[PDB]
Paper text:
The hypothetical protein ORF6 of the [name] phage is conserved among all Nazgul-like phages and consists of a single domain, currently annotated as a domain of an unknown function DUF2815. Here, we present structural and functional characterization of the [name] ORF6 that allows us to establish its function as a [name] (SSB) and extend this annotation to other DUF2815 family members. The SSBs are ubiquitous within all kingdoms of life and in DNA viruses, and protect ssDNA intermediates during replication, repair and recombination. In this study, we show that the [name] ORF6 is structurally homologous to the gene 2.5 protein from bacteriophage T7, and present a high-resolution structure of ORF6 in complex with ssDNA, which reveals for the first time the structural basis for the ssDNA-binding mechanism of T7-type SSBs.
In T7 gp2.523 and T4 gp32, the removal of the acidic C-terminus results in higher affinity for DNA, and to further test the DNA binding properties of the [name] ORF6, a recombinant protein ORF6ΔC was constructed with the C-terminal 21 residues lacking. While the ssDNA-binding affinity of the truncated protein remained unchanged (bottom left), somewhat surprisingly, a similar affinity was observed also for dsDNA (bottom right). While co-crystallization attempts using the full-length protein were unsuccessful, the truncated ORF6ΔC protein could be crystallized both in absence of DNA and in presence of oligo-thymidine (dT). ORF6ΔC crystals without bound DNA diffracted to a slightly higher resolution (1.34 Å) than those of the full-length protein and had three molecules in the asymmetric unit. Due to different packing of loops and N-termini in the crystal, the three protein chains have Cα RMSDs of 0.8 to 1.1 Å when superimposed with the full-length ORF6.
Author numbering: -1 to 37, 45 to 178
Write the structure that this text describes.
């Protein structure tokens, strides 16, 4: 799978930047998983605790700037509201699980690698949905991409892998 192919560039607390621009965010809480079947797109929201993910957030900001620079129509300007990463303490007032979190949204049209706690690829949609529920903790590999169309200018994140890390209280989404 993906993990065996990636070549690390920089490892920090709770994260890795790869030479290919992939970013691993480790030990984050998931929300709204759509890993079983597309919904077409697969998707997840990652709630990344600010106090333990500062360095990887800094790297994410840097990679967002690189992605703007290399957009296919030339350097792309994107407002903070149109990025895949948002501030849980400002942009999610009525969602308490977002307190003290960076909120990352990632999507893909093809299924990401989905690994259970034993680092085994899952295949059954029902098993995937049971294994990785909203509220559990995961680690995930994402990579930014730039978009410019009639609906706006965005920096999005491809969802490339999700690894189950720990059980916790379900959000019941």
């Amino acid at each position: 799978g993906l993990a065996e192919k990636l070549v690390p560039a920089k490892k920090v607390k709770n994260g890795v930047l790869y030479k290919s621009g992939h970013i691993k965010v480790s030990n984050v809480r998931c929300s709204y998983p759509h890993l079983d079947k597309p919904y077409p797109k697969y998707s997840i929201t990652l709630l990344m605790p600010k106090d333990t993910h500062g360095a990887i957030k800094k790297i994410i900001d840097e990679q967002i700037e690189l992605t703007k620079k290399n957009h296919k129509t030339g350097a792309l300007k994107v407002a903070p509201s149109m990025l895949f990463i948002k501030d849980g303490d400002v942009d999610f007032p009525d969602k308490p699980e977002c307190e003290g979190m960076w909120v990352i949204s990632a999507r893909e049209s093809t299924r990401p690698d989905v690994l259970n706690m034993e680092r085994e690829e899952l295949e059954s949609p029902n098993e995937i949905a049971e294994e990785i529920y909203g509220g559990c903790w995961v680690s995930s590999v994402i990579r930014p991409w730039s978009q410019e169309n009639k609906y706006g200018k965005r920096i999005n994140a491809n969802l490339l892998s999700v690894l189950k890390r720990k059980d916790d209280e379900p959000f019941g989404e």
